[PDB]
Structure formats: structure tokens, C-alpha cells
Amino acid sequence: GAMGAKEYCRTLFPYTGTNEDELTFREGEIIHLISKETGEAGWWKGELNGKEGVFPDNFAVQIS
């Protein structure tokens, strides 16, 4: 969130989750941002297909 109630990010590269808690996606998909601060710098938490997980936000671009 940070400066709003809704956060959307578009993926530009494919990311495969190494851990069961890690998120997985391909390039070209809108992801919902839940928390920009998960307790680790550079890690973002989002939801995709009812699943929540952390991951380096470099595989997606935030509209704002």
C-alpha cells in the first residue's frame, strides 16, 4: 500500500518460487501488492490465485 489502498504491478519477467511460501508467475500478469514491508529489504508480498507469498519486486512494475 504505502500511499493508497490498492496496489497493482505488471510482471515483465518469469519468476519461479524456490520455497513453498514463495510466489510464482510469468511475464505479463497483474499482481496485487499486499505489503511492501515484509521484514526483509527488497521483498514484496502479493496474492495470486488465492495464494500469498514474498519475492523480489524486480520481476514486476508498480503503476505508482
Cβ–Cβ under 8 Å, residues 63 and 4 = no
Q: How far apart are CA 2 and CA 39, in angstroms?
A: 15
Cβ–Cβ under 8 Å, residues 27 and 13 = yes
N-term to C-term CA, the chain: 10
- Taking residue 60's Cβ as centre, other Cβ atoms within 10 Å add up to 22
Q: How far apart are CA 60 and CA 26, in angstroms?
A: 10
Q: How far apart are CA 64 and CA 60, in angstroms?
A: 12
Q: Which domain holds residue 60?
A: 1-64
Q: CA neighbours within 13 Å on the CB side: how many for 11?
A: 19
Place of cell 514463495: 22
Q: Could you tell me the sign of the dihedral formed by the alpha carbons of 11, 36, 18, 52, in that order?
A: negative
Q: Indicate which CATH number applies to the domain containing 55.
A: 2.30.30.40
Determination approach: NMR
State which amino acid sits at residue 40: E
Q: How far apart are CA 38 and CA 44, in angstroms?
A: 7
Q: How many domains is the chain partitioned into structurally?
A: 1
